[PDB]
Amino acid sequence: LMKILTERGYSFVTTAEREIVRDIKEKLCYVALDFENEMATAASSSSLEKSYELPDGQVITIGNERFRCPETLFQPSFIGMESAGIHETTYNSIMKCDIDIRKDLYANNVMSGGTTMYPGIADRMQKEITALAPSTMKIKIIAPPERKYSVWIGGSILASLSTFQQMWITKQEYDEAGPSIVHRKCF
């Protein structure tokens, strides 16, 4: 996003400007359901762009930059990476599994992380996975409204379980075992 704001004219360089542009992406970005048609209709720039108030006071006006910078997730070649997008790596990971559990994995896609809070990412991901996968079974994507803190919610749920107290790494055990006890026990 910092790189593509330069072509618009506005220059952000230092770390403070990096935080500023992160704040910009926080609330002025989304994932388009379709990419080519959205870029085509961005030519008639009517309902796409909308201004943002920079901390200084001058106003920013970003058009196709709103949905171009989150598109890099599905097209990693934008930043120069020979890697498949998230929509394709999910299908690849599913195909890496056994032939029986794939049907259950298709209908249970748990979105997580703070990056996945883009308004309109679940729909695009579901469409892409449906296109990739065979057309018979249904593809269901799960986007809880609180998925921003999903990892912490799961950690708190796991911590208050009776079986869990036996899975800790007690201080005495670490003292007698060295730092490799975490590899011994945790995973």
Partner: protein, 186 residues
């Protein structure tokens, strides 16, 4: 008739000292720790003592059955005893007498479990339980020929897990004066 030599067990918090009666030194003085996993079944892939110590990063996780002198986990203790008896001590349980020792102030439940394990899992001819101290008073006197036994004193037994200050007067141990500090070499 002529019985076999009694066997002197010892299960300390840090070190276990096996041996025989009449010997001038314990046959084995090795740490009270057992290695355990988590085509031999997982029932038998366990090592104890120095073998367990050397085989620490090869795929085993060490664990100390005894802490503060009282045994918490029982699988480790019973496996430790069977490994000792049938691997290092090399004795048949049914034709020997054992002299187990364990620190005072232990729950009666621990003694009951020890007795039932010894007389069911192994079922030796006989089992005797003595207090870690006492033996200390017995070994105090060096030139113990016929008479020169002190038989009256105080034994300050400080070890790895717990220390005990036990007074003895004319052989009998005065219970009301027994006090124990829960700090030791560990």
């Amino acid at each position: 008739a002529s019985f076999n030599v009694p066997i002197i067990m010892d299960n300390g918090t840090g070190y276990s000292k096996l041996g025989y009666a009449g010997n001038d030194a314990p046959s084995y003085v090795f740490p009270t720790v057992i290695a355990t996993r988590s085509r031999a079944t997982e029932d038998l892939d366990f090592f104890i003592g120095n073998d367990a110590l050397k085989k620490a990063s090869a795929g085993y996780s060490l664990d100390y059955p005894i802490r503060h002198g009282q045994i918490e986990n029982w699988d480790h203790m019973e496996r430790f005893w069977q490994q000792s008896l049938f691997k290092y001590l090399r004795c048949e349980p049914e034709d020997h007498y054992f002299l187990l020792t364990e620190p005072p102030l232990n729950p009666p439940e621990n003694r009951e479990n020890t007795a039932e394990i010894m007389f069911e899992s192994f079922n030796c001819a006989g089992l005797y339980i003595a207090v870690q101290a006492v033996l200390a008073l017995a070994a105090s006197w060096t030139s113990s020929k016929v008479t020169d036994r002190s038989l009256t004193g105080t034994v300050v037994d400080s070890g790895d897990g717990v220390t005990h200050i036990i007074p003895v007067a004319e052989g009998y141990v005065i219970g009301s004066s027994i006090k124990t500090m829960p700090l030791a070499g560990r």
